[PDB]
Structures are given as C-alpha cells and as structure tokens.
Swiss-Prot record:
Domain Bromo: 9-113
Subunit structure, interactors included: Component of the BRF-1 ISWI chromatin remodeling complex, at least composed of SMARCA1 and BAZ2B, which regulates the spacing of histone octamers on the DNA template to facilitate access to DNA. Within the BRF-1 ISWI chromatin remodeling complex interacts with SMARCA1; the interaction is direct. Component of the BRF-5 ISWI chromatin remodeling complex, at least composed of SMARCA5/SNF2H and BAZ2B, which regulates the spacing of histone octamers on the DNA template to facilitate access to DNA.
Signal peptide stretch: none
Free-text tissue specificity from the UniProt record: Expressed at varying levels in several tissues, whereas a smaller transcript was expressed specifically in testis.
Protein name: Bromodomain adjacent to zinc finger domain protein 2B
Chain's gene name: BAZ2B
Family label: Belongs to the WAL family.
Location of the protein in the cell: Nucleus
Function: Regulatory subunit of the ATP-dependent BRF-1 and BRF-5 ISWI chromatin remodeling complexes, which form ordered nucleosome arrays on chromatin and facilitate access to DNA during DNA-templated processes such as DNA replication, transcription, and repair. Both complexes regulate the spacing of nucleosomes along the chromatin and have the ability to slide mononucleosomes to the center of a DNA template. The BRF-1 ISWI chromatin remodeling complex has a lower ATP hydrolysis rate than the BRF-5 ISWI chromatin remodeling complex.
Domain of life from the UniProt record: Eukaryota
Species of the source: Homo sapiens
Amino acid sequence: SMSVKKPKRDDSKDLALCSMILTEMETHEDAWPFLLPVNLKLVPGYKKVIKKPMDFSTIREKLSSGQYPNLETFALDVRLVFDNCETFNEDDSDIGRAGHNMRKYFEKKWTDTFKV
Ligand SMILES: Cc1cn(CCn2cnc(-c3ccccc3)c2-c2ccc(C#N)cc2)nn1
C-alpha cells in the first residue's frame, strides 16, 4: 500500500529472456501453424470464430517494439496462440497436435526461466 512496498523480483532481464523463449518457439519443428497470421481467405471460419487472433510473428513485432508492459502480458499472447488453436482445431489433427506440443514446450521454458 502507500509507502509499503513488497520486495519485487528483478525484471531487468525479462526482455532478453522472453526474446530467447520466442526464438526457441520460432525454430521448433512444430511451429509451422503459428509462424504467421492466419490467412482469412484460406481459412473459412477463422474470422468470425477467433475474436483475438495471434501468431508468433505478431508477438515478435510487439516484443521488438515495446508493446509488452511486462512478462505476463507476453505469456498471455503466447497462450492465446495455443488457446485459439484448440478452439479451432481437433486435438487429433496435425495442427491440433502441434499446438499441444508447442504449449507444453513453452510452459516448461516459462517455468524453468522465471519460476527459478
Ligand atoms: C498462413 C495461412 C496458411 N493457411 C492455410 C493452412 N492453415 C489452415 N489452418 C491453419 C491454422 C488454423 C488455426 C490456427 C493456426 C493455423 C493454417 C495455417 C495458418 C498459419 C500458418 C503459418 N504460418 C500455417 C497454417 N492459413 N493461413
């Protein structure tokens, strides 16, 4: 509260660490469904169904341009990629399976990097 500050974690490295995580995600072999925004002409339904599109290239742009206030806002956009993927794709599809794999991959890096 006013004049009563909790010690807070050192956030000085967060930009570099998030960039590294993103690089790792961009180079994963299962990243192909997520590298660029979904093309609304090739993909019937995505426009109406997915209210907040997101993809790795949009995250990279936002990260490079100071549009994440903090590391949680970054993680929210990564998770949004995978949540949108699950909304739109059967678990059993190649893209569905890709999204599950990429989510697991991200979350371990997240925990390892910042929960420690
Ligand atoms: C780009 C692009 C390519 N395509 C057609 C192949 N495709 C079909 N569905 C998806 C999709 C749907 C939901 C969530 C993620 C991917 C895609 C697809 C979209 C983007 C990329 C990239 N990069 C690859 C495939 N659409 N946009």
